[PDB]
């Protein structure tokens, strides 16, 4: 058992690097790989060799850079270039770091440098750190390039996210799904299925991408990867990046759960599918307040929320068919 250890720095960036380890192993092979959570370390147990791990990592980096070159100091509208990176400097910094990693690893040379970590990979980071009686100039936090690249691979391949422009400002919702007990390779790959590239929606009709919980509900509505959350316990760590007037900051860091929402969606769509997605999309587009009440009811197991959501939807344009009502009644028990 190679049992790769993962650096203990930040349980979010730690999760990203330990959670891209799995795709690095998969691209190199490494059958029968599992992840044991150590609170924050998130250790991974496998029978792979170091050279095979490096081959998988360089394969992942090659795929990522090939995707990056598709758009064009080169700036691409990809997940790891500009779709999630709210800072303009990182749009060029990250590809340079990744290609440096590629060049170093392809020559069987371990990286010998350290680089700044962006706020995207770990919101706990930033620009200033309180040492004793003030902050440190520059960016005090630095990470070895190997773990930096691994976490970037994990973020690009696995974690879903959403970008909404709405003119001058910009909102970026980032979601990462964290196992809590134990997972095998198939489970983690099933979670990887959730990730979809280029979620740069913008437009004006889809103004409901604000209210982060509503946005994640909308994203999960059209996803049908696997109902794993009903048999395994998972949590969600999510955060928002805002660029209101070139003032880059984070305004939401709530920690919700994903099991209840997925269970609700599966129970609702088990009866009717044609009247499920159309219902939810119409309700989101018309009754935003009703959608907020509905998601609050889902997350809090509240009866009045469903009634309020249905009333608000029926007020404007929502058909609200019978089968979904029966499914809701069954969920109510």
């Amino acid at each position: 058992f190679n049992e790769f250890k993962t650096p203990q720095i930040d349980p979010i960036f730690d999760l990203y690097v330990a959670y891209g380890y799995v795709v690095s192993l998969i691209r190199g092979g490494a059958k029968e790989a599992t992840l044991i959570p150590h609170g924050a370390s998130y250790l991974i147990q496998t029978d792979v060799s170091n050279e095979e791990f490096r081959h998988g990592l360089v394969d992942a980096l090659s795929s990522m850079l090939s995707l990056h070159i598709a758009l064009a100091k080169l700036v691409s509208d990809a997940d790891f270039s500009a779709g999630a990176n709210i800072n303009n400097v990182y749009w060029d910094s990250v590809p340079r770091n990744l290609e440096k990693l590629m060049k170093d690893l392809e020559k069987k040379r371990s990286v010998k440098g350290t680089a700044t970590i962006p706020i995207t990979l770990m919101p706990s980071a930033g620009k200033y750190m309180l040492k004793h009686f003030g902050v440190q100039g520059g960016n005090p936090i630095k990470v070895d390039l190997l773990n930096y690249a691994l976490a970037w691979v994990g973020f690009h391949y696995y974690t879903p996210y959403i970008k909404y422009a709405k003119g001058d400002t910009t909102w970026i919702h980032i979601y990462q799904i964290a196992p809590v007990e134990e997972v095998d390779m198939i489970s983690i790959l099933s979670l990887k299925d959730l990730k979809m590239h280029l979620p740069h929606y913008y437009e004006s009709n889809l103004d409901f991408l604000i209210n982060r919980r509503l946005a994640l509900l909308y994203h999960l509505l059209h996803s049908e990867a696997l109902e794993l959350f009903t048999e395994k316990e998972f949590v969600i760590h999510s955060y928002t990046l805002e660029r209101s007037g070139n003032n880059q900051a984070i305004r939401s860091f709530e920690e919700e759960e994903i099991g209840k929402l997925m269970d609700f969606l599966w129970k609702l769509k088990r009866r009717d599918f044609y009247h499920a997605i159309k219902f939810i999309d119409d309700l989101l587009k018309k009754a935003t307040e009703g959608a907020l009440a509905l998601i609050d009811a889902i997350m809090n197991e509240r009866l009045e929320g469903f009634y309020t959501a249905l009333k608000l939807g029926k007020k404007a344009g929502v058909v609200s068919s019978r089968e979904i009502v029966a499914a809701l009644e069954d969920i109510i028990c």
């Binding site: 009866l303 009634y307 939807g313 009502v325 109510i332 028990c333």
Partner: protein
């Protein structure tokens, strides 16, 4: 469980084919904390039966069907023993929940 039949009758008060839009009764039946106001709201909803009958009759599609008397006593044979409001809500909210269903009425 005598829910669809009454839900389709309550749906007659919200659908656009009946241009009367009885929304207050839906709020009354949904927002019921104890026994009395739930029965009051369901009575108010049922009282508009001739309204719906003459609206559908004068418009062309078949008139709406009144809930059968067979489950009328079924409504009061259970709600009587729901002394606790917490379990009473499971039916009080559901009554209005089924009032917004599709319930195709007129072609």
């Amino acid at each position: 469980g005598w829910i669809r039949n009454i839900g389709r009758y309550l749906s007659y008060l919200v659908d656009d084919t009946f241009e009367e839009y009885a929304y207050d009764v839906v709020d009354g039946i949904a927002k019921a904390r104890t026994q009395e106001e739930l029965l009051e709201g369901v009575y108010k909803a049922l009282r508009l039966a001739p309204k719906l009958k003459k609206k559908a009759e004068s418009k062309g599609c078949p008139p709406p069907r009144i809930p059968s008397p067979e489950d009328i006593e079924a409504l009061e044979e259970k709600v009587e023993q729901l002394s606790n409001p917490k379990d009473l809500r499971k039916l009080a909210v559901s009554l209005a929940l089924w009032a917004f269903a599709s319930w195709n009425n007129c072609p």
